[PDB]
């Protein structure tokens, strides 16, 4: 519960995720809270890649 709360918070504050990606991680966290750690890591990686995309748009 608290771990899902923390995971929600971190995912919603990843600045470069788009809303489709955010929604997907939120739903995955609701479906399988025991996977929070892995899901959070995966979201951070997508955020990293989105940041690279923003660099290449620029």
């Amino acid at each position, epitope marked *: 519960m608290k771990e899902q709360q923390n995971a929600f918070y971190e995912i919603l504050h990843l600045p470069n995720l788009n809303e489709e990606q955010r929604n997907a991680f939120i739903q995955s966290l609701k479906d399988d809270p025991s996977q929070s750690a892995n899901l959070l890591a995966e979201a951070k990686a*997508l955020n*990293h*890649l989105q940041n690279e*995309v923003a*660099r290449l748009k620029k």
Partner: antibody
Amino acid sequence: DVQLQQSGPGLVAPSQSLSITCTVSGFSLTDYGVNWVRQSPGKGLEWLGVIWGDGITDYNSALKSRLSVTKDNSKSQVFLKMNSLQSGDSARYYCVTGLFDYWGQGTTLTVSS
Amino acid sequence: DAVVTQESALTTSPGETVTLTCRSSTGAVTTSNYASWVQEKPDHLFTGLIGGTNNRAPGVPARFSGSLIGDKAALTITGAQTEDEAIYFCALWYSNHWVFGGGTKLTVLG
């Protein structure tokens, strides 16, 4: 004007390890990631790992226990270390930016059987 | 354990349009695979072309473009040039690692 310049010893035969330094200019390592990839003489491209702006590092899971990718944000340098080398690690090693958009010039490593 | 597959070879000629594709064994290529394309020319010289499905790297000529077509990623050269004869690799991101395709040898005849 992005530039990735590779240096370091490459192979150090006294240990059986590889050390490569990638010096980057044109962007801050605090913001953007750097990949390492290799290409063997008769194979394709193999991704080794990436170090992101915040220091998080993702590794190739088949090689992770032998790999260390680190960086110095102030020197704009990224360091690849690969240990316990075998002849199958002979390859050209490249540092690259986050979506493979800019490549270093490569470092050749040949490990004898 | 994803496998990325590309055409082994394609042949075009100057001024034609050619599309190279990049297939994922796990299903459709999507935005979150960040499909990226690199050119290898002789003496092991690599140049990035497209990153994150459809973004041209700085300095890359306008004739290169990237897209998703059906279930695959695609690199299109609209008006091929003789210097575009080269090997083209695609790379796809899978949750926590990159996987490269085997490369396509593009011949530009004439």
